[PDB]
Design a protein around this ligand. Structure first.
Ligand SMILES: *C(#N)N1[C][C][C]([N]C(=O)[C]([C][C]([C])[C])[N]C(=O)O[C]C2=[C][C]=[C][C]=[C]2)[C]1
Length: 215
């Protein structure tokens, strides 16, 4: 496992999206993980449809919340997920309108990273690619994050409330971190991204609910 990995330098990541007010972070976190695998496998980078998950994965609660796991299982059993292009994001739950012609990627199920193991999350990010993770993003400091490695000791690893994508990891001036792609738009944090503390005893529980799609 390399000291630092950034899948943005390998074209595994599409642009930062904006989930709006809809609590569909789990949808963007899943799509992001899929996009990474789609590029790694087929060689092409495509924008997948989070709206498709929000509307079709009835195992989740749409704009209310959901799990990346059900998201992945759905894509699998449904035999595909549409492209963002064929299934535009609207920001609110609507009736499932999946269209097989607009099918952009498939999935053979998912894998889960050992609960709370950042070292295992690290190796997974290097071996597989961008991974879907759940964090505690309920803090004022998290919302007004601008630069540097994020570390708020009020974060609670037992308080997971947001799903994001780990496109890599590394170190900035000795401070180990996780390169995290958010879905609050380009104006949030550092152009939609935030460097979250790595190896600081599972800060914000970034490894308590980590998973990635098999493809
Ligand atoms: C995003 N956006 N946010 C909005 C709500 C918050 N909650 C969830 O999505 C969590 C999982 C995260 C911690 C990653 N899970 C959830 O609330 O699912 C509700 C559910 C799903 C399926 C059956 C019963 C309940 C993430």
């Amino acid at each position: 496992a390399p000291d630092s990995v950034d899948y943005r330098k390998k074209g595994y990541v599409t642009p930062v999206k904006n989930q709006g007010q809809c609590g569909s972070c789990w949808a963007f976190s899943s799509v992001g993980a899929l996009e990474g695998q789609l590029k790694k496998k087929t060689g092409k980078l495509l924008n997948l449809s989070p709206q498709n998950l929000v509307d079709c994965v009835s195992e989740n609660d749409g704009c209310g919340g959901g799990y990346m796991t059900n998201a992945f299982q759905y894509v699998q059993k449904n035999r595909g997920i549409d492209s963002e292009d064929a299934y535009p994001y609207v920001g609110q739950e609507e009736s499932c309108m999946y269209n097989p012609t607009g099918k952009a990627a498939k999935c053979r199920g998912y894998r889960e990273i050992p609960e709370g193991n950042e070292k295992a999350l690290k190796r997974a990010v290097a071996r597989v690619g961008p991974v879907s993770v759940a964090i505690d993003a309920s803090l004022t400091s998290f919302q007004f994050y601008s630069k540097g490695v994020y570390y708020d000791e009020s974060c609670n690893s037992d308080n997971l409330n947001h799903a994001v994508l780990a496109v890599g990891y590394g170190i900035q001036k000795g401070n180990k971190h996780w390169i995290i792609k958010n879905s609050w738009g380009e104006n949030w944090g550092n152009k939609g991204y935030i460097l979250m503390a790595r190896n600081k005893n599972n800060a914000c529980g970034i490894a308590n609910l980590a998973s990635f799609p098999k493809m």
